[PDB]
Amino acid sequence: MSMTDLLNAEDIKKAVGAFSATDSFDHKKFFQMVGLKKKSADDVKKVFHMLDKDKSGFIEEDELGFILKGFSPDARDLSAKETKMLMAAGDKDGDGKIGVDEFSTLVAES
């Protein structure tokens, strides 16, 4: 869609920097720095739809290793530790996959 128009490029610029590490994943802080939780639920839809590269409606480990490339360039490959923890923390639901409504509220739980 446009992770720039919908959210804010300036908020994105901080957000990518909050995951720009090996294993130091900080989803609550990312979703606040990117202002995700401060945009609409239907915007949070188009958000997830940019990370879901394959359009299947579910993020799993193949996408989850470089998920940031839906937020923006200079995303990089996340650590194996990060991927492992992100999968387990991100799936609030027991599918082993991140879905939008979880992912939105994931970070309000923090």
Q: Which residues carry a binding-site annotation for Ca(2+)? A: 52, 54, 56, 58, 60, 63, 91, 93, 95, 97, 102
Report the site for Ca ion in 20-59 (rule: CB under 5 A): 52, 54, 56
Applying CB under 5 A, does 95 fall inside the site for Ca ion? yes
Q: Which is nearer to Ca ion, 22 or 56 (CB)?
A: 56
The least distance separating Ca ion from the CB of residue 95, rounded to whole angstroms, comes to 4
The least distance separating Ca ion from the CB of residue 51, rounded to whole angstroms, comes to 9
Applying CB under 5 A, does 10 fall inside the site for Ca ion? no
Question: Candidates 4-12, 29-37, 67-75, 85-93 — which segment interacts with Ca ion by CB under 5 A?
Answer: 85-93
- Per DSSP, the residues of the chain read --TTTTTTHHHHHHHHHHH-SSS---HHHHHHHTTGGGS-HHHHHHHHHHH-TT-SS-B-HHHHTSTHHHH-TT-----HHHHHHHHHHH-SSSSSSB-HHHHHHHHHH-
Q: Which is nearer to Ca ion, 20 or 56 (CB)?
A: 56
Nearest in space to 50 (alpha carbons), one of 78, 27, 73: 73
